[PDB]
Each structure stands twice: as C-alpha cells, then as structure tokens.
Design a binder for this molecule. Structure first.
Ligand SMILES: CCCCCCCCCCCCCCCCCC(=O)OC[C@H](COP(=O)(O)OCCN)OC(=O)CCCCCCCCCCCCCCCCC
Ligand SMILES: CCCCCCCCCCCCCCCCCC(=O)OC[C@H](COP(=O)(O)OCCN)OC(=O)CCCCCCCCCCCCCCCCC
Ligand SMILES: CN(C)[C@@H]1C(=O)C(C(N)=O)=C(O)[C@@]2(O)C(=O)C3=C(O)c4c(O)c(NC(=O)CN5CCCC5)cc(F)c4C[C@H]3C[C@@H]12
Lengths: 144, 468, 192, 240, 48, 48, 48
C-alpha cells in the first residue's frame, strides 16, 4: 500500500521472481508492477506439467520468499491461484420491464447466485460485475 | 482504451456511442454486453470492454454479414470516436484456451538495460513504422501509457515541529481519501461490510487536500497544508517485465489476405530496422499463441525426416533388401508435389490465407507419403517375387505393373474420394478441413498421374545397378 | 514420501501456530525448506586489496550478483552466506538521562516519524457529477539516509530548545547481523 | 439499519452536547464496489463471467451451469431475468455436427467408387461391411486410452475411411479375378486368393502404420495435437 | 471460547464459508455452529 | 556443555517504592541490551 | 459412511433468508404432515 510502481518492482516483484527461477517445467514468466501498490507475476509452464504439482511447488518457494518482503506487504497477504484467461460464458442479469432496481439486481446476483454457480463442477473462477450492498459512512471534514 | 487521466463518465460515454453502432447493425448483431472500467490489460477508469454476440450463422449468409465485414466496419470507430485512444473489434483465436484474442503477441525487451524512457522511445518508433506496413492492421500497445500523477512531498521536519505524527497523517489521509473497510454487519441473514470514507466533494481535486486536518500530540488540529505541498508529475502507472527483463507488449493483426506467418515476418523486418535508426540493443520474443506457431513450424523438417526413416527401415526389414526401400522412397517426391501444388493454387485462386503451411498441412503431408509408399510397395513386392520365381527383371516389372494397375488405382481413388468431402465443406470449422483435404487430394492426383509411371522405372534402374 | 507434498503439509500445519508466537519472532520471519539437491560449487567474492569490508561485499553479492545468476540455464537455487545493510541506532545512557528520555521514547519516535503514507486517487470511483480528471496520489515519506534519522525530533527542552535523535545516539549504516566474520585466503569475503 | 449507525455515540462537548455519528457523516446503504458499470443492450445490468477449471469438458460444464441456473430461477424476484450474452458452446456443437456429416458423406462416396470398380452388389458389400467394424472398434480402443470425440480424432477417422477399406478391396478384387479366370466355386477361389495376396496385405499395413508412428513422440502443444491423428490412424490400420 | 452459537455463525462460519469456492471436485459443504463456541465445516469431494 | 551465565534480579518491592513499574524496567532492558527491530527504510531501492 | 444408520437424509434450506423462527415453523409444518398422511414411519428432525 502506498508505493510507486518502481518501488513495487524493486522490492516485491523482483525478489519473488528470483525465487520462482528454478521451478520444474517453467516456460516463461510475465510480471507487472503498478503504482497503486500492486504486483502480479504469472508463471507459465511446459505442456505436460501437472497443474496441482505446479501450484504446490509455487507455494513451497513462496513460503521462503515471503520473509524477504517488506513487512507491510507481509501484512497484506500473498495469493496463489491457477486460472485461464478465456471466459467460457457471460450471463447478463437485468430487469426487462424496469421494475426491479439495479442495486437490487446486483445485490441479488452477489448474494444468491454467485456462490452456488462458482461451486458447479468444472467452473474454476467467477468474475462478477456490479457490487453488493454495503453500509456507507461518508464523512464531512468541516464537521470533523 | 481512453487517454490518460480519463474518468468513468468519459469511458462510459465512449461506450454509449460504441454500443449504438453495434446495436444499429441489425442484420449481423444480436446483443452486446459492456463493462466500463474493466479491460484485459487491467482495471482502470479509462478502460472498457464489449462482448458482442452476432446473429446465428443460418441468417448471416450474405457477404455483408460475415464476421470480418463487421470487424472492418467497426475498425472505423477509431476514426469517428474522438475521445478514445482506440476501439478495437477483435476475434477469438481458433483455440480460445491458448489465447485471448487472435493476432500476434510480441514482447519488446530492454536487453541492454537502457531505461524506461528509451524503451518507450523504441516502442513508439515500432508502432509508427508498423502503421505504414500494408500487411498489418490494428497494431497497438497492450499496456497502460505513461500518465500525469499527483505527488505529495511531506515535510518531515515541519511535521515533527508541529506535533504531527507521520503515522497519524497516514491514517487520517488514508481513510478519508482512499476509504477503509472497518467491520461487518448483517442484512437479511448475510454478513455484509461497513466502509468509512470522505464524501465525494472533499476528495476530487488537489485543493480538497486543504480541507483535512491532522491532530497533533497536544491534540490541536493542524491542516494538511501545513506539512505537505503537492505537485504534478509524469510517470509510468504500470511497469512490466518479461523473462526477468524490463519490457513492453505489442499486439496486432494481419491485414486481410495475409497469413499469421506473414504478419510475424513483417513485424520482424520492422524490428530489424531499429539499429539503423540509432536505437540499439533491443530484443524481442514471441509469446502466447505466436510462440506456439513458431514452435510448431520449427519442427516439421524433423517430423518428415523421422517418418521417412521409419518407412525405410520397416521396408528393409519386411523384404530383406536395401534396394527395394530405396526404390520405394524415391517416388515420394511425386506424391508430395501434388499436395503442395494444389494447396498453393487453392490459396491463390481462393484468396484464402488459411490454406497455408500449418499443422493440418503437416498431417496431410505425412498421409501423402504413406499413400505413395503403399502404391510403390504394391507394384514392387510382386515384381520381386516374380524375379525370384525366375523371370527377367523387365518381364517381372512390366508384368507386375500390368497386373497391379487396377487395385492401385481403385485404392487411390477410394482414398481421394474419402477426403473430398473435407475440401468441399462449409461452415463450422471448414478451414481446418480445407487444409487437410486440399493437401491430401492434391497428393492423390499427382500420385495417380505421376507416381505409377515412376515406380517401375526406379525399380528397374536400381535393380540393374544391384542385380540378382 | 513426495518431498514437495511433505513440505506443503508441514508449512500448512505451521499456519496454525503462527499466532501464538511472539511478535518479535513473527516479524523476523519463519521459513520452511526441504533438503533436496546438494552444492555444485561455491564462489567466494573477496577484496584482495583489503579495500572492501565483508558486509558491503555481502550486500553487494545480494543486490547485484544474485538475480543474474538465478536465471542461468540449469540453476535450481542460489544462496548467499550473509545479508545486507541495516540502519543502526546506538544509544547513550547518560545522554538519555540528561534529557530524561528512555529507549522506549526513541523507539516510539522512530516508528512514529518513519512511515509510508497511502492516500488514494483524484476523482475516486464514486466521483462527483462533471468530474474531469482521475489520477493517483502518491506520498513519499520514508526516510533514506543517516542524516534524516539523526534529525528526528524527540522533545523540546525546558528552555525552549530542540532535542533530536542525534543528541542521544550514534546513527550509522551497519550490518543486519554482527555474529559472523568471514574471510577468503585471509581477506574480507562473502560466499555464494 | 442505517438509523442505528446514525446513532453511534462519538464524544461530548465542553458545553455538554453529545456528538453523534449523524452529526458528522452521511450514512446510507450503497455498494461495496464502485469501479465497474455494466450494461446489456444499453440498459443497466449485472454480469457473471465464468472460466472453466483446467481439465474440464466445456460442454459438460455449460450443461451443469444451465442445470443449476434453471434450479435457481424458481426463487427470482418478480422482474428478474437472465440471458447468455457470450457463449462458446454453440460453435463447438455445430463443428462436431459438421465433422460427422462429412464422415457420413465420405462413407457414401467411398461406397460409390468401390461400386464403380466392382460392378456387382455382392462384391461391393464386402468392403463396405468393413467400415462399421473398424470405426467402432477404433473408438473402443482409443477410449481405452483416454482419447475423446473431438474435431481432431474425427478428422482422423474421415481420413482413415479411405485407407481402411484397402486390404478388403485388394482381397475382394483378387477373388473376383480368380473366379473369373478359372471358373471355380467361391470357397476354393478364396483360398487361392489369400495365398496370393497375404504378402501385399502385410506390406500395405506395415507402411501405412509406420508412417504415422513417430508422430506420437513429439512434445509440447504440437505433440498433443499430433497424438490424436497418430493413435487413431494406427489403430485403424491394425484393425483393418 | 465464550461465544453463543449465533456469534459463532456471524463472525466465523460465514467468513470461512465465503472462501470455499473454486475447489476442484467438490460436492457439498455442511457446517454447524454450536453454543459452546465451536465451528465445524465439512467439505465433501467427488470420487477420485 | 553448560556455561556460566548472568542473572538479573530486580526487587519488585524497591521498584514499587521507587515509582517504577516492572513493565518499564523490562522494556528498558529489552531495548537497551537485547536490541530491537523497529521498521524498514528503503535504501537505494531495496528494503533494509 | 455416516454417524449412525439411517435413510432418506433430507436437508431443508432457507433460501431467500426468512429467519430461524420461520425455518423451524416450516420444518414443523412438514413434520406434522409427514406423520399424518402416508408411507412414512419415524420422520424426525435430527439436531438440537
Ligand atoms: C525422398 C524425400 C522426400 C521428401 C518429402 C518432402 C518433405 C518436405 O516437405 O520437404 C520440405 C522440408 C521442410 O519443409 P518446410 O515446411 O519448408 O520447413 C522449413 O524439408 C525437409 O524436412 C527435408 C527432409 C528430408 C528427409 C530425408 C530422409 C532422411
Ligand atoms: C539410390 C539407391 C542406391 C542405394 C541402394 O540401392 O542400395 C542397394 C544396395 C544393394 O541392395 P541389396 O541388393 O538389396 O543388398 O545396398 C547396399 O549394398 C548397401 C546399403 C546399406 C544401407 C544401410 C542403411 C542403413 C540406414 C539406417 C541408419
Ligand atoms: C563455503 N564452502 C567452502 C563450505 C563447504 O565447502 C561445505 C561443503 N562442501 O560441504 C559446507 O557444508 C558449506 O556449504 C556449509 O555447510 C555452510 C553453510 O550452511 C552456512 C550457513 O548455513 C550459515 N547460516 C546463516 O544463517 C547466515 N545467515 C547470513 C545472514 C544471517 C545469517 C552461515 C555460514 F557461515 C555457513 C558456511 C557454509 C560453508 C560451506
């Protein structure tokens, strides 16, 4: 949080990259460092490498990598995922007659549909467009 | 893509215009789903995407309603939509698993470690030149441009003198401007979240930073302006590395009538011009589906050599000879000539870039090698047996040719008619079928009109050199 | 036993005990490794003119040599026998008693006066009608040099004077560890 | 409720007033995410984009999703509808049907040409009868090894249809000639024919099997594509 | 320790359950929250 | 094998009598004698 | 494969979040009709 893109690359992306150099069937690595504070490293593997073995190996290296990171980064957490780029489908939820509001539709998709669909067999990941309800407290700095 | 510092409202306006255009193409388009603020490159306010379902194939049967016609029509939204960087209608790759879009995928590397400014300089030269190549269309960066940024510089000495804790200023500004999730609450049996953030009017402009105060240790309130200045800068929002080296990503498409290999060749020609222009020490790699294309093309020679070797060795084992295998493998050029000739002529008189040297062509070539070997073996094994029984070499060979002409020709015609349906196919993956069929059927024709003549002559020559 | 599976299982169990550990221990970092393959070679980087100390060399091996070598065709792992620099605050007791200061006071001022400030964005997502610009606001706050640490403010004197860190301590760049001294052929060295 | 949040107590003034949260902030129920705006045909909408887990059959997964969704539909609020905006499985199903139609057409054409050369119905039926056996046996065998029904294995089958009838054509043609040459009974004639043509049958089979063998030993994505054609064709030739 | 069953459900069971997506081969999940303070979540997988 | 070691013995009573909390004493010794890691700074683009 | 032998393991779900009281009431209506009508012996709810 709070770091420039250069700081991210120098202090996070590069050290994690160096740790990953030496996975079994690695084909190429692609990484990016963003100025909001985020880092992304995508590891591609050779054909015939088992996805589950690759994931466990990546975690095994990440374990020791994560001590070399800035303590704030450590506090944020690091995630490991396996996923493909292409979407199989996109489902659109809408009100044909305009008698259910957009906030409601968005919330309904997030509370009752997203979790059961992301647990069907074969589905690997679900990307949702439109958020759920939240309690929003907007502050007035003059009154503070 | 929209220019730097572009808001969600402007991105959505571009999408409104863009949406109508597709909506008005009524003989071709069924529905469009659009999202503003999201793209494959990343998530930002100046990016957006559209999912466009065309009408059913049964209805889009005229030339006007083909996918490529719509792609060309939409490629003018770049000229009409003026607030965008680009609006790019793209197609899925044949194998949507292996990529995200069709085209080439190029990584420009900074091998010599010259810097982000120099790397960008090279990329802009590349895009400028590629704009002028008639073989390419839609060449673009696949990454965020360098953007103005607001830089705050906090005066530590002043803050310390004023009683202000830099951690305290972090906390206040972070929550006010960025927002913060505190804890959960329950709504209809589900746990949701509670957020605290400043109201919108207080966090739009740098002048609103002068409305926020930080409590010092004495407890008094000192404005943010007392220990922070602010400045406009220029910087990169998103740095990238490919194979442990700083890089940028360039993608494009071949112009109509041009193959994927030709697009890659044009791109590599363009990249070679860089040193002559003064920019030295930049490398490139092909990534993604382009990397797969290059690797598949690289190994066809080894596939051909190996298949020919195994045919040679099995034929030596089966007839306890060396001359018979050489005679057989000597007529393989004549089978292969039809396959290549018919493929090329079909490409030229159909204008199709799909009819090309690809994976389907490769399997067709191996099949044609097999057919040629089969025909040869039919004539020569009978010729050899006739010679063992006791018969002049020429008498045996001419007799065998006469006797086997009918089965050879009917088997070759059976094979050739088997694959003709592939060549004449239409719709739903007909490109692959066309590659296989054109290659195999051409091979069948040359094998029938050229091969049968050459089998006996090569046999008699080889057997006259190596008698008995 | 599959060594990768054994390693993941062990560290997975380790998640369950991390919260019970002391904070000081937690911050340093708990690492898990498996045995695996052995050493092919050891390279020694040294100063043959006694011009560079072991610490700078170590720091130099870690920040400059490490990552280029990791990318070599057949390398599995690269490891350095040593670490990099640290900022070192060495306190004086009598000086602290002069100004009536404690080590905890200095620690509090260090953690208070050295931070990263996160801010947000201009024209952030739920923006106002007619918003024209969206930009990222970054605030550079962390210290970088010994002079900045020397100039940290602690308190004021009774007679309106200013007392900084440099008045009770000796600020220095030094080693993250002081427990080992390594030499190659008799002179400063760091091992890879 | 928002009213409860409005009442959170914050502090007290020197005068004595009690500062609440409503006194400093606006509280309302909104989103947890403000960074996307999704529409469908120009109208506001919500979208779910699904990606398959690696190793799953897309058609199977799409069927399961539609099943679960049809189950869920029964509790929609009044006024909620859904629709697939972006979907790939139509093309897949269509292209499978394409390959199957061309395979049937291949069979018909091969039968016609074999009839053109073998002028009788009896002679003609024998190589035709080979096709079902070899096709179905090849499917059985390759399924034993985990190969599916995809566009590539179907292309291989279509390519094989014209090779698998070969050994049969050779056999039947030799019988017909022998029967014509010396007028003898079908049984005697056949015994004589096989003794003549067994070596040719073996040679044909050996070359056609050998050409497609090395293909199965390449790696990468290209090797995966190759193995389909390779294994299918090899099984077809041995079975023939 | 010390929590009522409702507290366990709101502050632990749903929080842990909302990450149990994307698991290959999952059939169903059964969870309970008891008034002695324990949360149990059982994840069941397809054969193989 | 075991080696001589030095033990600090602090009369809680005197400290109470002298107005010093046992916690203050502990922290002073901890920082003074043991050392302590406070936070990080970025020297030349690397975290130390 | 289960804590104790039994058949027809049914689960009644509170879709659209009615509440615990509502779920218990719905279950009770079900259990009342189950005993009274046909082809059912020993229909009981499991937990506390
Ligand atoms: C008798 C030999 C018959 C040769 C059959 C023709 C094979 C062929 O396609 O030749 C071209 C091939 C390279 O093909 P290309 O796609 O241009 O890859 C670059 O060139 C080759 O791979 C040469 C293979 C020669 C193998 C000799 C057998 C040992
Ligand atoms: C053009 C053809 C010239 C080569 C040739 O025809 O070889 C014929 C010769 C005699 O063959 P044969 O009479 O059957 O014993 O064959 C020979 O006498 C020598 C041929 C030996 C070939 C060895 C090849 C092994 C290749 C696998 C490696
Ligand atoms: C050098 N070479 C010729 C030896 C050799 O020839 C043979 C062999 N061929 O067998 C050996 O065994 C060696 O490889 C070996 O065993 C060693 C290590 O492990 C090791 C170590 O682990 C830590 N531990 C630390 O924590 C240090 N950290 C730095 C930052 C904070 C602390 C400190 C340390 F000095 C060492 C020394 C090496 C020696 C090495």
């Amino acid at each position: 949080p709070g770091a420039s893109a250069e700081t991210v690359e120098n202090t996070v992306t590069q050290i994690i990259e160096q740790q990953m150099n030496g996975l079994d069937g690695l084909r190429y690595i692609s990484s990016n460092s963003a100025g909001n504070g985020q880092a992304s490293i995508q590891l591609n593997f050779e054909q015939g490498v088992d996805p589950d073995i690759a994931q466990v190996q990546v975690q095994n290296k990440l374990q020791s990598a994560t001590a070399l990171l800035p303590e704030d980064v450590q506090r944020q957490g690091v995630t490991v995922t396996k996923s493909g780029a292409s979407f199989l489908q996109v489902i659109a939820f809408y009100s044909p007659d305009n008698n259910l509001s957009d906030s409601d539709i968005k919330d309904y998709v997030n509370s009752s549909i997203k979790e059961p669909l992301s647990r069907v067999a074969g589905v690997g990941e679900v990307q949702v467009f439109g958020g759920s309800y939240a309690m929003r407290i907007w502050l007035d700095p003059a009154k503070l | 893509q929209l220019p730097p510092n572009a808001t969600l409202d402007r991105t959505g306006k571009v999408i409104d215009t863009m949406t109508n255009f597709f909506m008005n193409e009524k003989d071709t388009v069924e529905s469009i789903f659009t999202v503003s603020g999201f793209s494959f490159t990343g998530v930002g306010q100046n990016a957006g995407i559209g999912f466009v379902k065309l009408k059913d194939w049964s209805k889009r049967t005229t030339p006007e309603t083909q996918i490529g016609s719509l792609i060309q029509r939409g490629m003018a939204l770049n000229m009409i939509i003026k607030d965008a960087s680009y609006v790019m209608p793209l197609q899925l790759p044949a194998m949507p698993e292996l990529g995200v879009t069709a085209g080439f995928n190029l990584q420009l590397k900074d091998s010599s470690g010259q810097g982000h400014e120099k790397l960008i300089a090279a990329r802009n030269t590349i895009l400028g030149l590629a704009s002028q190549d008639k073989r390419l269309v839609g060449v673009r960066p696949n990454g965020q441009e360098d953007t103005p940024q607001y830089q705050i510089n906090v005066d530590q000495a002043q803050a310390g003198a004023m009683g202000v804790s830099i951690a305290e200023i972090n906390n206040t500004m972070r929550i006010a401007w960025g927002g913060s999730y505190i804890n959960d609450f329950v709504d209809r049996g589900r746990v949701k979240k509670v957020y605290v953030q400043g109201d919108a009017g207080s966090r739009m402009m740098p002048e609103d930073l002068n409305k926020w105060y930080v409590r010092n240790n004495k407890g008094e309130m000192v404005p943010f302006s007392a220990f922070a200045t602010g400045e406009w800068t220029y910087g990169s929002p998103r740095l990238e590395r490919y194979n442990g080296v700083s890089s940028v990503n360039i993608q494009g498409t071949p112009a109509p009538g041009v193959s994927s290999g030709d697009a890659m060749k044009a791109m590599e020609e363009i990249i070679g011009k860089l040193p002559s222009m003064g920019l030295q020490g930049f490398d490139y790699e092909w990534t993604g589906l382009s990397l797969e294309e290059r690797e598949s093309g690289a190994q066809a020679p080894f596939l051909y050599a190996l298949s020919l070797l195994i045919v040679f060795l099995c034929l030596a084992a089966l007839y306890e000879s060396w001359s018979i295998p050489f005679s057989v493998l000597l007529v393989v050029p004549l089978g292969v000539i039809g396959a290549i000739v018919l493929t090329y002529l079909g490409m030229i008189i159909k204008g199709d870039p799909n009819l090309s040297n690809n994976i389907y062509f490769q399997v067709a070539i191996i099949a044609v090698i097999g057919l040629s070997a089969k025909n040869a073996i039919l004539i020569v094994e009978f010729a050899k047996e006739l010679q063992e029984k006791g018969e002049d070499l020429l008498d045996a060979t001419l007799h065998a040719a006469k006797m086997r002409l009918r089965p050879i020709i009917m088997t070759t015609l059976a094979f050739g008619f088997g694959v003709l349906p592939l060549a004449l196919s239409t719709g739903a993956g007909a490109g692959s079928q066309h590659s296989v069929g054109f290659g195999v059927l051409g091979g069948v024709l040359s094998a029938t009109f050229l091969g049968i003549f050459f089998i006996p002559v090569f046999y008699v020559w080889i057997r006259s050199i190596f008698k008995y | 036993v599959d060594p990768d599976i054994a390693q993941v299982q062990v560290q997975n169990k380790l998640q369950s005990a991390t919260a019970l550990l002391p904070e000081d221990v937690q911050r340093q970092g708990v690492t898990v490794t498996k045995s695996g393959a052995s050493f092919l070679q050891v390279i020694a980087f040294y100063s043959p003119d006694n011009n560079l100390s072991d610490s700078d060399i170590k720091d130099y091996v870690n920040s400059s040599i490490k990552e280029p070598l990791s990318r070599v065709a057949g390398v599995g792992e690269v490891q350095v026998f040593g670490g990099s620099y640290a900022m070192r605050i060495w306190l004086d007791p009598a000086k602290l008693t002069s100004y009536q200061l404690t080590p905890s006071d200095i620690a509090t001022a260090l953690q208070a006066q050295n931070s990263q400030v996160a801010v947000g964005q201009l024209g952030g997502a739920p923006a106002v009608q007619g918003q024209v610009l969206n930009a990222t606001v970054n605030a550079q706050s962390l210290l970088q040099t010994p002079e900045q640490f020397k100039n940290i403010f602690l308190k004021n004197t009774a007679s309106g004077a200013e007392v900084r860190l440099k008045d009770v301590a000796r600020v220095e760049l030094g080693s993250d560890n002081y427990q080992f001294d390594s030499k190659f052929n008799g002179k400063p060295a760091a091992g890879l | 409720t928002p009213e409860q949040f409005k009442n959170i107590f914050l502090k007290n003034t020197a005068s004595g007033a009690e500062v609440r949260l409503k006194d400093v902030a606006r509280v309302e129920l909104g989103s947890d995410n403000y960074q996307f705006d999704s529409k469908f045909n120009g109208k506001p909408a919500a979208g779910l984009a699904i990606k398959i887990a690696t190793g799953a059959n897309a058609l199977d997964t799409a069927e399961a999703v539609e099943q679960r969704l049809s189950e869920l539909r029964k509790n929609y609020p009044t006024g909620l509808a859904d629709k697939l905006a972006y979907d790939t499985t139509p093309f897949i199903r269509l292209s499978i049907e394409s390959v199957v139609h061309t395979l049937i057409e291949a069979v018909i054409l091969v039968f016609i040409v074999m009839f053109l050369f073998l002028q009788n119905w009896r002679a003609t039926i024998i190589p035709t009868l080979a096709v079902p056996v070899v096709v179905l046996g090849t499917f059985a065998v390759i399924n034993i090894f985990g190969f599916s029904i995809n566009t590539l294995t179907m292309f291989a089958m279509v390519l094989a249809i014209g090779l698998l009838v070969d050994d049969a054509i050779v056999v039947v043609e030799n019988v017909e000639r022998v029967m014509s040459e010396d007028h003898t009974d079908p049984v005697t004639a056949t015994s004589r024919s096989m003794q003549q043509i067994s070596g040719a049958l073996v040679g044909i089979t050996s070359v056609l099997t050998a050409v497609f063998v090395p293909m199965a030993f390449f790696g990468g994505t290209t090797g995966v594509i190759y193995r389909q054609f390779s294994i299918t064709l090899v099984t077809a030739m041995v079975l023939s």
